Structures are given as structure tokens and as C-alpha cells.
């Protein structure tokens, strides 16, 4: 009786800890081997959830990068377009066409092509010296000549076609710009579209948070099981003393 009594409290605390740990799970444990397979299932769920979480995070990061790219000063290639714009007494072409209608925006964007984002500089000789210096700039920088406040439409070999525009960029060379959707020009409702991107990313962030919480919960369950087994295995699944002591 005294030996069983001495053994008792350890066994009782072990039983209570094990019952709490198992009930926290949907399963009830019955063996050390069974605990090991539960650990294996925990590892499987963890290695899965982490992959989904990372995939969602990559999608998320792409979404915020896209949202930022449309931010300032007027959503464009502002990484270097900024310095390229204020360093010279010019104005962004996209900003110049900032207020164009959503309907004329695609037409003008197709008409202007890769030069939509160009910078208006009436001289073209201010950039002539600095050209050699420019090593950190978009692989294709675009500049146009005219009055930034009242620039006259760039003369083009344009040829409008159904929802598109052909153009002769140089002798024997044509660029065919199909009417884009949600264009560069007309950057007033494009702010509304980056708001729509924020709305879209809201659900992505919600799902990422759920996945991260699941990962944390699985990690904490695994750590609790580890601590358990550290303190617990010696008496796990052993016979009940209380009944023996009463008998």
C-alpha cells in the first residue's frame, strides 16, 4: 500500500496531463507507439501547411508589389522614373494624360506604346550629357520633346483598327498595340483598381493568417507532446494505483 501510494501522485499527474493533451486532439492515445504515429501525422500536417502558407505568401507579396507599383507619384515605373523626371525640367507623360477618360485611355495607351511612361523634355539636350552616366535606369527609357504643360500630340504613323492601333515605328518596322485593359493613361480610376487590388489581397492575407495560425498551433502541440514525453513516458499507460489501493 505504501509503495503504491508513493507511486500514485506521479501516475495521477501523468494521467491528467495525457488526458488533457489527447482531448485537445480529436484522438485518444493508448500507446507509446501510438504517440509516435501521432507525431508522424503532426509532422505531415506541418510540412503540408507550411507549403500552402509559403505559396499564399508568395502570391501575397506579388500582390503588394503590384499595388505599390501604381502608387506614386502617378503609378508608373517610379523606381527610377522619379529621379529621371525631376532631375530634368519635364513631366511624366502618363501624368500628363492622367485625367483622360477610361474609354480614351486604352486608345491613347495603345497609340503611345512602350513610350506611354516617357518623360516630356522639350530640349532632349539636357539628357544628352547625362546619358553616359545613366547605368541604373529602366532597360528602355523613353523621352519625348515638347512643352510639358501643353505638349502637342506626338506625331505617329498611327492607323486605328478595331480595338487596336497599328503604327510604323521606323522604316520597315511596325508595332501593333492592341487596346489594353485598365491602361497606363487615365490614372484616376487606376487608383480605384489598385484599391480593388487591396480588396483582393485582403482575402489572401486572411488565408495566410489562418495558415500561419494553423502552423503555430501544430508547432505548439508538437512542443507540448515533446515536453510531455520528457516528463511523462515513465508512467504512461500504466495500471491505476487507486483501485489497487482501495482493494
Amino acid at each position: 500500500i505504501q509503495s503504491l501510494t508513493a507511486r500514485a501522485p506521479v501516475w495521477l499527474a501523468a494521467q491528467d496531463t495525457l488526458n488533457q493533451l489527447c482531448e485537445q486532439s480529436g484522438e485518444t492515445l493508448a500507446s507509446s507507439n501510438d504517440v509516435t504515429e501521432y507525431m508522424q501525422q503532426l509532422l505531415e500536417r506541418e510540412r503540408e501547411a507550411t507549403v500552402e502558407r509559403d505559396e499564399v505568401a508568395a502570391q501575397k507579396r506579388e500582390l503588394e508589389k503590384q499595388i505599390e507599383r501604381l502608387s506614386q507619384p502617378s503609378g508608373a515605373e517610379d523606381s527610377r522614373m522619379i529621379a529621371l523626371a525631376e532631375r530634368f525640367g519635364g513631366v511624366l507623360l502618363s501624368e500628363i494624360y492622367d485625367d483622360i477618360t477610361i474609354d480614351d485611355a486604352p486608345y491613347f495607351s495603345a497609340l503611345y506604346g512602350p513610350a506611354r511612361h516617357g518623360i516630356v523634355v522639350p530640349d532632349l539636350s539636357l539628357v544628352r550629357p547625362h546619358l553616359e552616366t545613366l547605368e541604373d535606369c529602366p532597360e528602355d527609357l523613353y523621352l519625348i520633346e515638347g512643352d510639358p504643360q501643353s505638349f502637342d500630340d506626338s506625331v505617329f504613323n498611327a492607323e486605328e483598327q478595331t480595338n487596336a492601333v497599328l503604327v510604323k515605328s521606323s522604316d520597315r518596322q511596325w508595332r501593333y498595340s492592341r487596346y489594353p485593359e485598365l491602361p497606363l493613361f487615365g490614372r484616376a480610376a487606376r487608383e480605384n483598381r489598385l484599391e480593388a487590388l487591396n480588396l483582393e489581397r485582403d482575402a489572401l492575407a486572411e488565408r495566410y493568417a489562418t495558415l500561419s495560425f494553423d502552423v503555430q498551433k501544430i508547432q505548439r502541440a508538437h512542443q507540448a507532446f515533446s515536453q510531455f514525453v520528457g516528463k511523462h513516458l515513465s508512467v504512461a499507460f500504466d495500471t491505476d494505483p487507486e483501485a489497487e489501493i482501495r482493494e
Binding site: E64, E68, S71, A205, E206, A209, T210, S212, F213, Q216
Partner: peptide
Amino acid sequence: IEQMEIELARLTEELTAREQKLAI
């Protein structure tokens, strides 16, 4: 406690978003 942890994670994300918005 799990739900509060979820809320802290979500609010950390929201704080990052708000900080970026304020900076811009």
C-alpha cells in the same frame, strides 16, 4: 487563446499595411 493569437497575427498584418499607407 488561439483566437486571440489569430487576431494578433491579423492585426500585425493590418499594422504593416497601415504603416505603408501612412508613409505613402
